Design a protein around this ligand. Structure first.
Ligand SMILES: CC(=O)N[C@@H]1[C@@H](O)[C@H](O[C@@H]2O[C@H](CO)[C@@H](O[C@@H]3O[C@H](CO)[C@@H](O[C@@H]4O[C@H](CO)[C@@H](O)[C@H](O)[C@H]4NC(C)=O)[C@H](O)[C@H]3NC(C)=O)[C@H](O)[C@H]2NC(C)=O)[C@@H](CO)O[C@H]1O
Length: 153
């Protein structure tokens, strides 16, 4: 505990481990972030073709990135740079950590990361796509555990 999952590209592992270090999570957060990135962008390979392609590795929506800019700068010591893949991961990590702490659990953190705080079945994203936040949380939590995750909170 813990090892890089074989299927996670080594550049991505570095980003998530840097994020893990910033929150003192012993490598466990990095496993969760790996699962999130696999689902959101497939490490960057599943982006092309999508209206939300430009939102990067963790697919944080523009209005959501905008709300967290000052907090990002405070946490990481530099202004958010969307062209930086490490910053993309740092931003997604900050928001997911915030949700997990605020709502009280990983599952709920994942659900509200994907759906927002006021998700309901039939809610749509900034591109008008239906958000299956419950299914997202289920499948990302399973992937997290499959990578060797060991927490619920
Ligand atoms: C390349 C590709 O297409 N990949 C797919 C992913 O894009 C995809 O899921 C999308 O993921 C993002 C991030 O998790 C998710 O974004 C959330 O969107 C909601 C709804 O807009 C947000 O909330 C609102 O925020 C505003 C401003 O703060 C609030 O005023 C408002 O109240 C909120 N609304 C509600 C209802 O609470 C979240 O902030 C936002 N999260 C983030 C981190 O930005 C999209 O909704 C996801 N879209 C879909 C259709 O799921 C993934 C889905 O499984 O699939 C990839 O393949």
């Amino acid at each position: 505990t813990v090892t890089k999952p074989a299927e996670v590209p080594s550049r991505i592992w570095t980003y998530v481990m840097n994020a893990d270090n910033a929150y003192g999570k012993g490598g466990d957060f990095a496993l969760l972030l790996s699962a999130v990135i696999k689902k959101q962008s497939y490490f960057g390979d599943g982006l092309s073709g999508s209206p939300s392609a430009g939102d990067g590795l963790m697919q944080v929506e523009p209005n959501t990135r905008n709300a967290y800019l000052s907090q990002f700068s405070a946490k990481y010591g530099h202004a958010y740079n969307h062209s930086s893949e490490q910053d993309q991961v740092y931003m997604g990590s900050l928001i997911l950590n915030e949700k997990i702490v605020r709502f009280g659990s990983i599952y709920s953190g994942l659900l509200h990361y994907n759906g927002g705080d006021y998700w309901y079945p039939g809610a749509t994203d900034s591109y008008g796509r239906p958000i299956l936040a419950d299914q997202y949380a289920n499948t990302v939590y399973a992937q997290y555990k499959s990578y060797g995750g060991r927490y619920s909170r």
